[PDB]
Amino acid sequence: VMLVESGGGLVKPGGSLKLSCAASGFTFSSYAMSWVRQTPERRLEWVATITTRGYTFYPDSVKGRFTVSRDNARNTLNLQMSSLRSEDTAMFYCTREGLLLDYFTMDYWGQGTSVTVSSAKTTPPSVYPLAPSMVTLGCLVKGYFPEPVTVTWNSGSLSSGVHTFPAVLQSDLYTLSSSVTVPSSSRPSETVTCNVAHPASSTKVDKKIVPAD
Amino acid sequence: DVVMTQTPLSLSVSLGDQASISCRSSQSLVHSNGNTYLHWYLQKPGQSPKLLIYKVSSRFSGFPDRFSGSGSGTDFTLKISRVEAEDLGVYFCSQSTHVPFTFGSGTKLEIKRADAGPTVSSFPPSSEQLTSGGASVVCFLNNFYPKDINVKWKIDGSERQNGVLNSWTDQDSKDSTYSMSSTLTLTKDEYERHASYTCEAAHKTSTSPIAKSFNRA
Numbered sequence: 001v002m003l004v005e006s007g008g009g010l011v012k013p014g015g016s017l018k019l020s021c022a023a024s025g026f027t028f029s030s031y032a033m034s035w036v037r038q039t040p041e042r043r044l045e046w047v048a049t050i051t052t053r054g055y056t057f058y059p060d061s062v063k064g065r066f067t068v069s070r071d072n073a074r075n076t077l078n079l080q081m082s083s084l085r086s087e088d089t090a091m092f093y094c095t096r097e098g099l100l101l102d103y104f105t106m107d108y109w110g111q112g113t114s115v116t117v118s119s120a121k122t123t124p125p126s127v128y129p130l131a132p133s134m135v136t137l138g139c140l141v142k143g144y145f146p147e148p149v150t151v152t153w154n155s156g157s158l159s160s161g162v163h164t165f166p167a168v169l170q171s172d173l174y175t176l177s178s179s180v181t182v183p184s185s186s187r188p189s190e191t192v193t194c195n196v197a198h199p200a201s202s203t204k205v206d207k208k209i210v211p212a213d
Numbered sequence: 214d215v216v217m218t219q220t221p222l223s224l225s226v227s228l229g230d231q232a233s234i235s236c237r238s239s240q241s242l243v244h245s246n247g248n249t250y251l252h253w254y255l256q257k258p259g260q261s262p263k264l265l266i267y268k269v270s271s272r273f274s275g276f277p278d279r280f281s282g283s284g285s286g287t288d289f290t291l292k293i294s295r296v297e298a299e300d301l302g303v304y305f306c307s308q309s310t311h312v313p314f315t316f317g318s319g320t321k322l323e324i325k326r327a328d329a330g331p332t333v334s335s336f337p338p339s340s341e342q343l344t345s346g347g348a349s350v351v352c353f354l355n356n357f358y359p360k361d362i363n364v365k366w367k368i369d370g371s372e373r374q375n376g377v378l379n380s381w382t383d384q385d386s387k388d389s390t391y392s393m394s395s396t397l398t399l400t401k402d403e404y405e406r407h408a409s410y411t412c413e414a415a416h417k418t419s420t421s422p423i424a425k426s427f428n429r430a
């Protein structure tokens with residue numbers, strides 16, 4: 001079972017957005033599907049469900065604004081959102097009502113797609129290096145909007161000893177740091193680089209950490 | 214709607230020990246068809262919910278037998294015997310008997326381990342940043358335990374709180390540790406105005422605070 005959401009983004013209040021959920025690993029057409037969003041406060045809140053035969057239902061807080069739909073041929077669950085409101089921002093997941101011939105219950109969840117509804121304008125991040133038996137280095141991703149942003153080290157190689165902290169909001173821009181610890185001999189002998197990706201602004205930024213002078 | 218409560222909200226267990234999470238329903242979750250569609254999800258840090266147990270006690274063949282669910286009507290309990298590091302995260306109970314479908318706030322599961330001192334490291338602004346007219350000083354409080362910790366900045370010996378952003382990570386499942394980062398941001402103008410910059414952390418593992426600093430000079 002593979003569910004992958006997509007289309008998340010930043011919309012101004014009153015705007016509309018169309019999310020998608022690609023499915024694989026099971027007979028998509030013989031399952032009801034649903035959308036649940038996780039709020040920043042981390043609360044999970046159901047938002048829509050579509051039936052096998054196309055029947056559709058939702059909670060009042062969303063009626064007249066969201067529309068679930070499915071493309072069985074393309075194996076895709078869809079979610080059209082209009083009149084988006086600031087309190088809508090959340091991580092949106094597609095879930096499957098897996099108990100085949102026996103009532104509602106959510107089986108699998110997707111990876112989730114992030115959507116921010118706000119008036120703040122998308123802003124690229126500035127990536128600054130953080131250099132000084134074990135040595136710790138970091139990267140400061142600052143002043144970007146909105147979420148999210150991906151941070152990897154050595155193109156994904158360095159996994160252990162990594163600490164990517166949750167971005168904080170001080171205005172209408174985020175800021176996050178990520179640290180990496182390696183054996184003293186490891187650097188500056190071998191290069192250590194942080195790669196930062198910000199889909200919103202369509203920006204990738206690599207920063208090789210060099211010794212300071 | 215049907216309100217789903219959980220207890221306790223937090224929980225720290227030692228490995229090999231048993232954890233017990235309760236879920237309270239504002240209404241009987243017994244469906245008119247006789248089934249009770251109450252389930253338990255577990256969202257590990259940085260991941261999405263995984264169905265652990267559904268219909269009160271069925272184990273979603275993914276998870277092991279050390280995970281057991283029970284209860285009836287409006288009261289349900291989940292027990293995790295011989296806890297493991299991979300078990301840490303947020304546990305949610307959910308209901309499908311009634312529409313709208315609702316979830317509980319969840320219960321956090323922490324692992325109890327041996328206290329560990331933080332490895333704080335301070336980082337002066339970066340050359341690139343200063344050219345932009347901005348100046349941020351970062352400090353890392355890595356791999357410490359418990360989660361309790363205090364960070365204090367001082368410019369030339371004076372505490373500073375304005376322009377100080379903080380962030381904490383979730384318990385790490387490879388060592389049951391915790392980590393925090395702190396950033397003191399200010400304009401280049403003010404940055405080049407002071408000589409001393411310090412990050413001061415107060416933690417259980419040490420009597421005197423762990424201080425790290427550097428001088429622009």
Ligand SMILES: C=C1C[C@]23C[C@H]1CC[C@H]2[C@@]12CC[C@H](O)[C@@](C)(C(=O)O1)[C@H]2[C@@H]3C(=O)O
Nearest residue numbers: 031032051052053097099100101102103104
């Ligand atoms: C209002 C609905 C929608 C139902 C039937 C009924 C109650 C439970 C739903 C499911 C849930 C599980 C299966 O996916 C399904 C195919 C099934 O058997 O039951 C669903 C069906 C549908 O979407 O057509």
